[PDB]
Nucleic acid binder design. Structure first.
Ligand code: ZN
Length: 636
RNA sequence: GCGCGCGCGC
RNA sequence: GCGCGCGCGC
């Protein structure tokens, strides 16, 4: 409802900024920080005497936030009659930018647009803005675009260049506290964030706290450490089936062990799942396709096994075995070549040991007893509770549902996936009104007597959420403390942190390096075929790398990109790959650039070989590779 | 293609 | 820092 009366706490928060102070406004998500910024932005613009005129820039980090604040600000400042506009990576690259800023009063931007136009010098000073609003301002640190912008601000403020400087405003729900393990290190971190934004005030709700607390979702947090089964023989057996089908894949693909860059994979993990993905991706489905289709069968079978171990981990062995029983029922009912019928046979040789390990009652899952008990209590306390349960995987949703309906001690419960249903089970949220929230072994609250239960067997997950709570304490205590300082004392502290930080940036400027200047071969990382030479390579727009000549065009084949994107300098037409029918390693992309159809390469697709010595070096990033970096020439 | 943030591991 | 992964940007 950002399209229609302030609560008192919005007035309280708006006040310091309305007084001309650089403020970080820190308030919970969804409490109306946006409205608060509409109030501040109205006041600022209307304050100027007739004859004078403000200009406001609002920074947004993601396209959807950009889109929605552009509509909101546009919507709101009609009747006032100010000109409202936006610029993102799409409001490009043929809009005259210093002229858009000129002819508008409220400009909504992604930060990088501004960073580029300061860097290119098209916008010479931040002085054309009278107010700057940073959404999610806690991002103003390290090398983030917000911080680059403030580096430009502070360079003007400290090195004296009048030049009036805009007021600066930041919006967040959480400021602190970085890698801090002490309350004193929390305050240093928070003081550094203010300094980064030249803020002298942190605005929080102090006087209208009790009004705020009525509308804030703050559930009672509970942590419950559970033990898992001591012996899992079901896992041992599947694990051997996974070794069986991994070795069958090595037969068809030697050096499977290097077909993905993911290391130390383990069965029954998310990370194994991702290994499977990268491998299927590194083998798209002429003669190489027949090998990759065979590999697809193996890896899609390992995926099901992998899904099954996870189900067994958190729900019951039955649930895991039934999942596989279904799957293999599909395999014969829609196939069913050599590999497939061999694979399901290897399974069937094992089905019956798995069957009896499954029904073995000493093999029951003790974690489910804990979930069950938590459920009973809540409902013999309030029989009309609405629970949402969060689990790891699509398949676990089904596991837990069958479990619930199958449990005599949950009777009583009516599961769904709004409504004649008490428990919603799901994976991610997208479709507060929930008085019970269970995170069953779920991998907290980034969105009435409500409470959140956290159930896990992992001690480190408990630890992490207790550390997080302790950080939130330190944050809130630090803020309280610094809000008691006289603003002048605080501004003097901030001034010399800025002076100190500026020195570091200016001192620690990375020296321009000596290039090695000699010609090196670029070879394919995967097959090792010679791609090209370093003397054939040219640098486009400082940061991108291309190869000259007709000789190279034969070494790569290209392939259509499903969704082609247009950036600042080029349009990503295609993905490019090695020319051999039996490698197809990802080499980079193909762009339309200044009407040229040229290839763009990533160094991580190649091995750099020294010619005379055959010695090789791997590089992840081009900026680490110090060779003679030759500028691209528009007619060469 | 490149850049930035965050999480896990050493 | 290195590796891997997630997210977002031009
Ligand atoms: Zn190759």
């Amino acid at each position: 409802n950002l399209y229609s009366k302030p609560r008192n706490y919005q007035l309280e928060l708006a006040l310091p900024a309305m007084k001309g102070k650089n403020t970080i406004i820190c308030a919970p998500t969804g409490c109306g920080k946006t409205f608060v910024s509409l109030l501040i932005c109205e006041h600022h613009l209307k304050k100027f005497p007739q004859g004078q005129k403000g200009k406001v820039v609002f920074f947004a980090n993601q396209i959807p936030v950009y889109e929605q604040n552009k509509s909101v600000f546009s919507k709101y400042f009609e009747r006032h009659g100010y000109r409202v506009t936006g610029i993102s990576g799409a409001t490009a690259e043929n809009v005259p930018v210093e002229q858009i800023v000129e002819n508008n009063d409220i400009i909504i931007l992604t930060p990088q647009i501004l960073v580029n136009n300061l860097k290119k010098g098209t916008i010479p000073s931040l002085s054309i803005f009278t107010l700057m609003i940073f959404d999610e301002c806690h991002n103003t640190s390290k090398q983030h675009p917000y911080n680059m912008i403030m580096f430009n601000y502070l360079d003007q403020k400290l090195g004296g260049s009048s030049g009036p400087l805009p007021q600066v405003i930041g919006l967040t729900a959480s400021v602190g506290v970085g890698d801090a393990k002490t309350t004193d290190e929390a305050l240093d971190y928070i003081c550094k964030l203010c300094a980064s934004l030249d803020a002298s005030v942190i605005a929080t709700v102090k006087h209208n706290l009790e009004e705020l607390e009525q509308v804030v979702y703050k559930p009672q947090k509970f942590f419950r450490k559970v033990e898992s089964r001591i012996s899992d023989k079901f896992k041992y057996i599947i694990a051997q089936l996974m070794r069986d089908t991994e070795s069958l894949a090595k037969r068809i693909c030697k050096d499977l062990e290097n077909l993905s860059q993911i290391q130390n994979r383990e069965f029954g993990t998310q990370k194994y799942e991702q290994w499977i993905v990268t491998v299927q991706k590194a083998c798209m489905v002429d003669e190489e396709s027949r090998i990759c289709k065979a590999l697809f069968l193996y890896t899609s079978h390992l995926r099901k096994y992998n899904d099954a171990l996870i189900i067994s981990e958190h729900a019951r062995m039955k649930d895991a075995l039934d999942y596989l029983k279904d799957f293999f029922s599909n395999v014969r009912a829609a196939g069913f070549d050599e590999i497939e019928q061999d694979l399901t046979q290897r399974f069937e040789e094992k089905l019956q040991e798995l069957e009896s390990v499954s029904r073995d009652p000493s093999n029951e899952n003790p974690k489910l007893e804990d979930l069950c008990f938590i459920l009973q209590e809540e409902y013999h306390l309030n029989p009309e509770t609405i629970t949402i349960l969060f689990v790891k995987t699509r398949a676990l949703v089904d596991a837990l549902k069958n479990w619930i309906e199958g449990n005599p001690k949950l009777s009583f419960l009516k599961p769904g996936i709004d409504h004649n249903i008490l428990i919603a089970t799901s994976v991610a949220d997208e479709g507060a009104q929930c008085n019970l929230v269970i995170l069953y072994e779920y991998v907290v609250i980034k969105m009435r007597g409500s409470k959140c239960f956290l159930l896990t067997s992992n001690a480190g997950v408990i630890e992490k959420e207790q550390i997080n709570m302790y950080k939130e304490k330190m944050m809130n205590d630090s803020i309280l403390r610094l809000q008691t300082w006289d603003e002048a004392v605080f501004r003097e502290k901030i001034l010399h942190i800025q002076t100190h930080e500026k020195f570091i940036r200016d001192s620690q400027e990375k020296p321009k390096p000596v290039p090695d200047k000699e010609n090196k071969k670029l070879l394919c990382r995967k097959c090792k075929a010679l791609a090209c030479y370093t003397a054939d390579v040219r640098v486009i727009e400082d940061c991108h790398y291309t190869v000259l000549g007709d000789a190279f065009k034969e070494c790569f084949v290209s392939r259509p990109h499903p969704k082609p994107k247009q950036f600042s300098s080029f349009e990503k037409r295609a993905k490019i790959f090695c020319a051999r029918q039996n490698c197809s390693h990802d080499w980079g992309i193909h762009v339309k650039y200044k009407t040229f159809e040229i290839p763009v390469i990533k160094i991580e697709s190649f091995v750099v070989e020294d010619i005379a010595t055959g010695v090789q070096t791997l590089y992840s990033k081009w900026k680490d590779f110090h060779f003679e970096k030759i500028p691209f020439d528009p007619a060469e």
